[PDB]
Design an enzyme around this catalytic site. Structure first.
Site, short mmCIF file in Angstrom:
data_model
loop_
_atom_site.label_atom_id
_atom_site.label_comp_id
_atom_site.label_asym_id
_atom_site.label_seq_id
_atom_site.Cartn_x
_atom_site.Cartn_y
_atom_site.Cartn_z
N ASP A 329 3.72 51.48 8.19
CA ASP A 329 2.65 51.76 7.24
C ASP A 329 2.20 50.48 6.56
O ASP A 329 2.95 49.50 6.46
CB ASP A 329 3.14 52.77 6.18
CG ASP A 329 2.06 53.13 5.15
OD1 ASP A 329 0.87 53.32 5.51
OD2 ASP A 329 2.43 53.21 3.96
F1 BEF Z 1 -0.99 52.33 4.79
BE1 BEF Z 1 -0.22 53.65 4.68
F2 BEF Z 1 -1.11 54.86 5.13
F3 BEF Z 1 0.07 53.91 3.18
MG LIG Z 2 1.68 54.24 2.32
#
Ligand code: BEF
Ligand SMILES: [Mg+2]
Length: 638
Positions: A329
């Site tokens: 992420d």
């Molecule tokens: F970049 Be992740 F979706 F928080």
């Molecule tokens: Mg995130």
């Protein structure tokens, strides 16, 4: 109320019952009563495993070791049956503290969505359950409420925190569609100013939302479902042991009868051919395995904890070494999660100091998220702040106006200057700003009377930690890596270049993260590192889920199998490194534990008794435990 102290009492009873009658002042009547207690405490829990499953089911090791103790007492009483039921009881307890599982986070997820919604009915507004919303119902979402349904805005304008789904915790300005009949027929053309999701948090303004997905089909209801219908992920060393046990028990029972009837064919006394069966029985009890397999886990887990990595069980600690791939992420994982002033672009005769002083003069009065960042960073760059502006007002959805040095100042989006009285935006400044937007900066344009002063650009910058940790993990062989973010693609690509990740996807929904993970899991082990709800499905479906231990949503910390309690990414090289040694230590301990049995089954078929049995088992257990304890010395080498 826990049974592990029965093993402790078996220890106290086994030690004092063994020592006292021979190296102390105790009656064999009393030290035997201690040996009795060492069978009582040993037996009462270890019994039930076999009793329960064999009432209807299949044979298991708990049958072997439990009857092995009985044989030891009945024939050649040495009370080694106690050494067996003690060591089997700790063999259970050490596994008991090793377990962990993925499905547990349901408790938090439910809190993200309200039970009820206001829904329009002509001249009335009724209250209904979300279960009872029809598609095309108009729900009313008032100030700071949780949105109850996925839809599009049809009345009112507001700033909505879509963090559970986009992963961005900055309010996004929302506006009503221009024709709801068209929007309802052409959902694919919904601008992101108008689409809204369940479990978003509304802002200052009430919104009417036309429902477009049923209660069970909202993006958040999918997040809930995908986290629940994920599986447990098996430890390979555990399931290997399951196989071995299921074949081993009916294997050794063959020798139990062949040797029981040995007197019928060979010159041996009947009661000692029975002693031959009991000897190969109690020798077969893999006391080494029952201790080796969990002790490597508990040791490595405690070492990880002292290194700032919480680990939920043995399975993720075994998986972490064998990873071919890892996915990250962006927001709050690779980045900290807040805007910084990163680009300053004066225009015309404006100086850089004039642009920054007018910007901070106005942003000192704003309460939009970017304003605090502008004031912080202007005070850092110039060392000092100017006087605050006058006449501050919002221009909802576009920016702000104020007055500075007797001149009207507008600051905001490019769309504001097309919408207000002053000089139109120059064609070259427009392109310079659009190039800042393409390079992933959130951009504000600043204008003062006749004069545009220029533009400023803010971005959520990556952690300094990040590029170092990425290259490090590539050296350990994680050559398959990608970034998967719910944030827009320009910010993702700009941060991907800064971090050095060549494949980077933005504008993802949580299911899209699960899709990229599945495309990785097919070709190797994959880990998912994340901080938010929109990552929890990917964490559950990946081979191992890793949460940012401090920035993490509680949903993520519950769902993940690993938590980086420091929010330090340099724990990841350590976590995989320890995992690999943890796999080696048990690998070696496994073939010791098997050999001690598999090589001494014939040594007892050759007539060795119970006396050698306890000694060899003791040696094997001690060696496996001590080898496992090596993991406590493992070093970061940071
Ligand atoms: F970049 Be992740 F979706 F928080
Ligand atoms: Mg995130």
């Amino acid at each position: 109320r826990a049974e592990v102290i029965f093993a402790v009492l078996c220890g106290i009873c086994l030690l004092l019952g063994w020592l006292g009658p021979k190296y102390g002042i105790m009656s064999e009547q009393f030290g035997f009563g201690l040996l009795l207690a060492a069978y009582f405490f040993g037996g009462y829990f270890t019994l039930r495993e076999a009793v329960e499953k064999i009432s209807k089911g299949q044979f298991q090791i708990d049958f072997l070791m439990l009857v092995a103790a009985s044989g030891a007492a009945i024939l050649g009483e040495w009370a080694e049956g106690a050494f067996l039921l003690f060591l089997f009881s700790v063999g259970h307890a050490l596994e008991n503290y090793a377990m962990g599982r993925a499905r547990n986070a349901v408790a938090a997820l439910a809190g993200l969505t309200p039970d009820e919604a206001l829904v329009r009915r002509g001249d009335k507004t009724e209250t209904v359950l979300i279960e009872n919303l029809l598609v095309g119902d108009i729900v009313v979402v008032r100030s700071n409420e949780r949105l109850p349904a996925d839809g599009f805005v049809v009345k009112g304008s507001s700033a909505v925190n879509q963090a559970p789904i986009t992963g961005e915790s900055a309010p996004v300005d929302k506006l009503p569609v221009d024709d709801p009949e068209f929007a309802a027929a052409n959902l694919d053309k919904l601008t992101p100013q108008t689409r809204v999701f369940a479990g978003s948090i509304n802002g200052s303004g009430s919104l009417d939302v036309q429902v477009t997905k049923l209660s069970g089909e909202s993006t958040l209801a999918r997040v809930v479902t995908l986290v629940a219908e994920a599986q447990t992920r098996q430890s390979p060393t555990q399931n290997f042991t399951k196989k071995f046990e299921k074949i081993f028990v009916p294997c050794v029972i063959a020798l139990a009868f062949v040797t029981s009837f040995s007197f019928l064919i060979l010159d041996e006394t009947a009661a000692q051919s029975f002693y031959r069966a009991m000897a190969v029985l109690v020798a077969a009890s893999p006391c080494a395995l029952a201790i080796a397999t969990p002790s490597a886990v508990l040791s490595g887990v405690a070492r990880a904890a002292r290194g700032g990595v919480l680990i939920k069980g043995g399975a993720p600690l075994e998986a972490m070494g064998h990873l071919d791939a890892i996915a990250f992420d962006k927001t709050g994982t690779l980045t900290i999660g807040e805007p910084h002033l990163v680009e300053i672009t004066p225009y015309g005769d404006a100086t850089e100091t004039e642009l920054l002083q007018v910007s901070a003069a106005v942003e000192m009065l704003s309460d939009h998220p970017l304003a605090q960042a502008v004031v912080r960073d202007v005070k850092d760059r110039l060392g000092d702040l100017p006087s605050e502006a006058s006449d501050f007002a919002n221009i909802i959805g576009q920016g702000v106006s104020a007055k500075v040095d007797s001149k009207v100042v507008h600051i905001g989006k490019t769309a504001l200057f097309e919408s207000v009285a002053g000089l139109p935006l120059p064609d070259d400044l427009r392109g310079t700003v659009e190039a800042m937007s393409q390079n992933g900066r959130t951009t504000m344009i600043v204008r003062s009377g006749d004069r545009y002063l220029g533009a400023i650009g803010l971005m959520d910058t990556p952690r300094e930690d990040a590029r170092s940790v990425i290259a490090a993990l590539r050296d350990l062989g994680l050559k398959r890596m990608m970034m998967i973010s719910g944030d827009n693609q320009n910010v993702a690509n700009a941060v991907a270049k800064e971090v050095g990740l060549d494949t980077a996807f933005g504008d993802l929904m949580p299911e899209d993260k699960v899709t990229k993970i599945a495309a990785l899991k097919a070709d190797g082990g994959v880990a998912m590192v994340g901080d938010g709800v929109n990552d929890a499905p990917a964490m559950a479906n990946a081979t191992v889920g890793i949460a940012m231990g401090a920035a993490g949503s509680d949903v993520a910390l519950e769902t993940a199998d690993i938590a980086l309690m420091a929010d330090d990414l340099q724990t990841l090289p350590f976590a995989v490194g320890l995992s690999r040694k943890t796999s080696r230590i048990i690998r070696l301990n496994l073939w010791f534990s098997l050999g001690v049995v598999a090589l001494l089954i014939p040594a007892t078929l050759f007539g060795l008794g119970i006396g050698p049995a306890v000694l060899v088992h003791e040696g094997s257990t001690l060696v496996v435990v001590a080898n496992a304890l090596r993991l406590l010395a493992f070093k970061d080498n940071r």
